[PDB]
Amino acid sequence: FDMGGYFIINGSEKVLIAQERSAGNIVQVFKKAAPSPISHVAEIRSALEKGSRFISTLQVKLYGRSSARTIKATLPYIKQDIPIVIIFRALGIIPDGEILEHICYDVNDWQMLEMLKPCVEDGFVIQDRETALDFIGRRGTALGIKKEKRIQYAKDILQKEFLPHITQLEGFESRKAFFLGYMINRLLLCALDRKDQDDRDHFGKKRLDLAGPLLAQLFKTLFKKLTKDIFRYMQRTVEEAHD
Amino acid sequence: EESLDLDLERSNRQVWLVRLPMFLAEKWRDRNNLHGQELGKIRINKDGSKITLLLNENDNDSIPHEYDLELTKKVVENEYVFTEQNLKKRDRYIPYVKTIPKKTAIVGTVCHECQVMPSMNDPNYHKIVEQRRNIPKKEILDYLFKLFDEYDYWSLKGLKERTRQPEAHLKECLDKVAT
Amino acid sequence: DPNEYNEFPLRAIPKEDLENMRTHLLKFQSKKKINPVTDFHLPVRLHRKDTRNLQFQLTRAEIVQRQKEISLRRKTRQLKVLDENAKKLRFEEFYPWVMEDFDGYNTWVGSYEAGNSDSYVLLSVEDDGSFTMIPADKVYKFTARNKYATLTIDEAEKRMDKKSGEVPRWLMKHLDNIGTTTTRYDRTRRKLKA
Amino acid sequence: SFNQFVDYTLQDIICEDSTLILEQLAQHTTESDNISRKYEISFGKIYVT
Amino acid sequence: TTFRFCRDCNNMLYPREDKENNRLLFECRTCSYVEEAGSPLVYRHELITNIGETAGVVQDIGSDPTLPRSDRECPKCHSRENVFFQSQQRRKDTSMVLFFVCLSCSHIFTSDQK
Amino acid sequence: TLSHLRRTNTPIGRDGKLAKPRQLHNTHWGLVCPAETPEGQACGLVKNLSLMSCISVGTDPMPIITFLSEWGMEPLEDYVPHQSPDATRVFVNGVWHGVHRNPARLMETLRTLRRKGDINPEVSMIRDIREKELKIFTDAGRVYRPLFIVEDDESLGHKELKVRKGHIAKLMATEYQDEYTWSSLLNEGLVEYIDAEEEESILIAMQPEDLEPAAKRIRATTFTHCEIHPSMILGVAASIIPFPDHNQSPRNTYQSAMGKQAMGVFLTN
Ligand SMILES: [Zn+2]
Ligand SMILES: [Zn+2]
């Protein structure tokens, strides 16, 4: 009658318990308190099974309660809160009404358009993708053969690290643009109170992990430790031999 | 060698654009096939709006033969298809950025986008759906006199092969003249 | 079926022709219909170049006018592995595609699409009515650029900074009236006049 | 969960990162040439007991 | 109140005033296209709204099974079937007015009688 | 012991709020016992799964996305909002992959093909038709519980759950054989896994006849599902509580706390 999925270490029956967390890679919005300069935000967690833990947080912040109606965004490894028309142009959408079509869907509604008009006036100045990409976001490491910031370096950022889902290879900036437009759309719905505040405490937006993922995590990390020791002693064998 | 510009005669050409299911696309991207043989048949209406593909029996009925054409985009603008052949062989201008312009020819304008979809009523159709679900002290002194004559800062390591002699004998001889 | 149609079941490409062939697909991002054989001040050169200071880069007409006027390692490293085809693609698209007329009045900057480049196949009618099957390889997207006298990153940063609570609405018009950073067509016209 | 992790995701976690090479051509000029000394190590199928 | 775009180049038009002919001329900041304005209205803040209880209607709302069903009729087609549901706007002061959507007349109607 | 195998534990911090998940929520139904909580500084932290509760072990999504390509979507590369003003966005694990014109046929086709068994039944799908959206979830980490299916239409008339007396007779026969299984009932589509996320497309029936035809105690017409038995929302020690309606809830709380400290027998060896 001893049906039990446990483990036998050192002469001791031993069981592991489930852990939980919010589900990654799914939209949430918050309503931060009034006295802060931020009112409505969003977040995306990430994990891709699970190389170097693939944390890669994201947020899009909102200013004003008034005349401070602007939408800046943060990405790694950028320390500055970048306004978002810059991001659209940098990913390669120049003509303004097409950024508007990426954001909203019904052209007949307008409240989103007055919401975005100050942001377009923020983006009124920069009219080219690599000029937009030229904005620094230094945060390390040191510059290579550059002038101020390599546009190659910025595009390498946007390919490899940002948004570790839909792609990370080379060529799906339009998918990225649509994803960000959907994010902006739901943020604007939360700001304009047509749609409500989300809930953190709902169950399906959480997940439960078990021994599978736990052994996966520990096994991956100790395997990386293993692999760095494999690379060790390969440089040390300047002399013989191939043991 | 040849002209660096592009051909323009083949520009005026309507092109039909087709998407395809993966198994059908694997067969229609066979370079061992594709020599000029005719493999299907088509059937349009006078007014259009319903075009079917009558696939010939070359497929041996692992796939259907009855297919329909789904003209998603009947009118298409600004879509151009071209070819490429490698060449036969304040005012600073860089005429060579190692750009390699090719014998390129614009060879067609897309006019109609369509798609071949396996007609589900076929018995060979939806079988593909279960498939998709399943899947010497004296001489050397004259010799070294030549060596500093050959080069002033001659290497000590390079001195070894030029002597190939006892190095302790070489070390004593080196100290007597120079470094 | 009663033959009210142009029946021609497919012929195909010569295999011997098909080597050294790369046949991409082009699209323009504008609602108005564009036909370069009607628009462009031909000759038209297609080149794969970098775009750094492309506004500051000289036009081909300007180049022709100028030509006429002149006439210890530390012994340890690691290549973390990566796909050779992906690396070749990255080095190919290290520079994008650009086509433009001789004048430089209209220029187009291309970019790369990886969305659906595998599944497409070509039905191009021939003169007799033949339908050769050309399996597509890649699809590229072109946009116009510097058609409207684009600005400069440094003064752009000074406008971005809070020097003005709101930048002037006709500030670009004032800069154009000053004549700083004019259009490529205007620069080519001025160089041809000079 | 245990059976799933034993059957799969282990061959996956091997084939994800199994590649390791140190091919030493010459690491300076010549050395004539020297040869592209492919010191290659990688892991194939795994086993359980 | 809408944001027109330059028909030559799809860009956000800005208002700018004629110097002497005293007319608002929406000039493109990208290209030289210009256009006179129909109304002197430019900007509009609208600090009070009450809107959003109604829309979000698809043509097959009743295809979902979860909505309740009643027997009040549509006052155009008189069919007794119906689908009723409350406001689509959610503020802390939105009303318990109800919205009644039918399948026969495919029409939206309410139950207020003030 | 059979309690202690099925435990769950979250981290929060030191003090925390109270509307934040220290206290229970309506979402918890059918998954976690609303009584078997530990007491003392961690009440509402540890919680205990349901009886039929089962966890998601994940399945790779690329056959699904190719299937979904083949049955027709516009891939996003030629989307335009004007010419597609009302079509439904398609998601897979929070990833945009498609927008598609005809949602109803696609939804029923996916449901039928799940029922016929050509998709692993752990996969879940929601049609939030109010917002013209569609969701697909196939990761590991979801929680699900069985249901009885219902076809609305019926040659015999009004509305009925599909399973009949003959099937359960065959089950009885196989049990007293000492060749149906639960899976061998699943394959032909009489029960169906539904996750913790789907329910808002589903009306639930408490009893197999609660309104199915059209003093002791006190007790719509568009059902699609009924539970197997209302008694199976509980947990391990929660089963042992005799007549667990007929008391007050904190007494159930102390009972679940107490039962872990009982002697008797534990194994036989
Ligand atoms: Zn314009
Ligand atoms: Zn009516």
DSSP code string of chain D: -HHHHHHSSHHHHHHTT--EEEEES-SSS-SSS---EEEEE--------
Q: How far is C34 from chain E (nearest CA, A)?
A: 13
Question: A56: alpha, beta or left, given left = phi > 0 and alpha = psi -120 to 50?
Answer: left
Length of chain F counted residue by residue: 269
Could you tell me which of B84, B103, B96, B105 has the C-alpha nearest to residue B2? B103
Structure token pair of residue F70? 């083949």
The CA-based diameter of chain A, rounded to the nearest angstrom, is: 76
Question: How many inter-chain contacts (E to F, CB under 8 Å) are there?
Answer: 27
CA distances from F52 to F34, F144, F193 (A): 15, 8, 11
Structure token pair of residue F167? 């099937």
Nearest by CB to C1, from B39, B43, B100: name it: B43
> Does D4 contact F at CB distance below 8 Å?
yes
Are the beta carbons of F88 and F134 closer than 8 angstroms?
A: yes
Query: What resolution in angstroms, rounded to 1 decimal?
Result: 4.1
Total H helices, total E strands in chain B: 5, 6
How far away, in angstroms, is E18 Cα from ligand 1 center? 18
Collapsing DSSP to helix, strand or coil, C68 comes out as: helix
Discontinuities in chain B with C to N beyond 2.5 Å fall right after 89, 135
- Ordered DSSP codes for C33-59: ---HHHHS-S--EEEE---TTTTTSPP
Same domain, F76 and F135: yes
Strand-pairing partners, residue C108, are C99, C144
Q: Which long-range contacts (CB under 8 A, 24 or more apart) does B103-106 make?
A: B103/B2, B103/B3, B104/B6, B104/B7, B104/C46, B105/B6, B105/B7, B105/B10, B106/B6, B106/B7, B106/B8, B106/B10, B106/B11, B106/B80, B106/B81, B106/B82
Residue A209: exposed, middle, or buried by beta-carbon count in 10 A (0-12, 13-18, 19+)?
A: middle
Same domain, F108 and F73: yes
- Residues of D (1-49) whose Cβ lies below 8 Å from A: 1-2, 4-5, 9-10, 13, 16-17, 20, 22, 39, 41
The CA distance from B83 to A141, in Å, is: 42
Same domain, F158 and F106: no
Chains touching B (3+ CB pairs < 8 Å):
C, F
Structure token pair of residue B134? 């399943």
The CA distance from A137 to A133, in Å, is: 10
User: Phi and psi dihedrals of C3, rounded to 5?
Assistant: -75, 70
List of chain F residues whose C-beta atoms are within 8 Å of the C-beta of residue C116: 75, 77
The CA distance from F118 to B134, in Å, is: 8
CA distances from A188 to A103, F127, F134 (A): 10, 23, 20
- What is the DSSP-derived secondary structure letter of residue E40? S
> Does C173 contact E at CB distance below 8 Å?
yes
Question: Cβ atoms within 10 A of the Cβ of C30, count?
Answer: 16
C68 HSE (CA, 13 A, CB side): 9
User: Phi and psi dihedrals of C111, rounded to 5?
Assistant: -150, 175
How far out from the chain centre does Cα A141 lie?
20
The CA-based diameter of chain E, rounded to the nearest angstrom, is: 66
Helix axes B137-150, B167-175, angle to 10 degrees: 70
Structure token pair of residue A209? 């992990």
Q: How far is D4 from chain F (nearest CA, A)?
A: 7
Same domain, F175 and F194: yes
What stretch of H or E contains A20?
A: strand A18-22
Q: Is E10 in Cβ contact with A98 (below 8 Å)?
A: yes
Q: How far is F70 from chain B (nearest CA, A)?
A: 6
The closest ligand to the CA of E27 turns out to be 1
Same domain, F100 and F145: no
Discontinuities in chain C with C to N beyond 2.5 Å fall right after 71
**Which residue out of B2, B3, B4, B6 would a mutagenesis test of the C interface target, given it has the greatest number of C Cβ atoms within 10 Å?**
B6
Could you tell me which of E54, E99, E64, E102 has the C-alpha nearest to residue E82? E102
The CA distance from B18 to C26, in Å, is: 16
Query: What is the domain-level CATH number for residue F132?
Result: 3.90.1070.20
The b-or-e profile of C90-116 (16+ CB within 10 A means b, else e) is eeebeebbbbbbbbbbbbbbbbbbbbe
Instruction: Please give the method by which this entry was determined.
Output: cryo-EM
Same domain, F192 and F160: yes
List of chain C residues whose C-beta atoms are within 8 Å of the C-beta of residue F76: 115
Q: Angle at CA C97, nearest 5°, toward C91 and C99?
A: 160
Domain of residue F84: give its range: 58-139
List of chain A residues whose C-beta atoms are within 8 Å of the C-beta of residue C51: 130
The CA distance from F133 to F138, in Å, is: 17
Same domain, F153 and F103: no
Domains of chain E: 1-45 (2.20.25.10), 46-114 (2.20.25.10)
Could you tell me which of C63, C49, C171 has the C-alpha nearest to residue C108? C49
Could you tell me which of F128, F148, F156, F254 has the C-alpha nearest to residue F214? F156
Write out chain F in H/E/C secondary structure: CCCCCCEEECCCCCCCCCCCCCCCCHHHCCCECCCCCCCCCCCCCCEEECCCCEEEECCCCHHHHHHHHHCCCECHHHCCCCCCCCCEEEECCCCEEEEECCHHHHHHHHHHHHHHCCCCCCCEEEEECCCCEEEEECCEEEEEECCEEEECCCCCCCCEECCCHHHHHHHHHHHCCCCCCHHHHHCCCCECCEECCCHHHCCEECCCCCCCCCCCCCCCCCCCEECCCHHHHCCHHHHHCCCCCCCCHHHHHHHHHHHCCCCCCCCCC
Residues of C with CB under 8 A from a CB of D: 73, 75, 77-79, 81
Structure token pair of residue B173? 């001889």
Nearest by CB to D5, from A49, A212, A224: name it: A212
User: Phi and psi dihedrals of F135, rounded to 5?
Assistant: -125, 150
User: Phi and psi dihedrals of A74, rounded to 5?
Assistant: -125, 145
Q: Is B17 in Cβ contact with C30 (below 8 Å)?
A: no
The closest ligand to the CA of E100 turns out to be 2
Are the beta carbons of A216 and A50 closer than 8 angstroms?
A: yes
> Does D41 contact C at CB distance below 8 Å?
no
What stretch of H or E contains C60?
A: helix C60-70
Same domain, F144 and F100: no
Q: Angle at CA E85, nearest 5°, toward E83 and E88?
A: 135
List of chain A residues whose C-beta atoms are within 8 Å of the C-beta of residue C93: 170
Same domain, F126 and F156: no
The CA distance from C169 to C33, in Å, is: 31
Chains touching A (3+ CB pairs < 8 Å):
C, D, E, F
The b-or-e profile of F70-79 (16+ CB within 10 A means b, else e) is bbbbbebeeb
CA distances from F46 to A20, A134, F26, F252 (A): 11, 50, 17, 16
The CA distance from E25 to E43, in Å, is: 15
User: Phi and psi dihedrals of E87, rounded to 5?
Assistant: -60, 145
Are the beta carbons of C53 and C72 closer than 8 angstroms?
A: no
Contacts of B84 (CB under 8 A, 6+ apart): B102, B103, B104, B105, C21, C22, C23, C24
How far away, in angstroms, is E114 Cα from ligand 2 center? 21
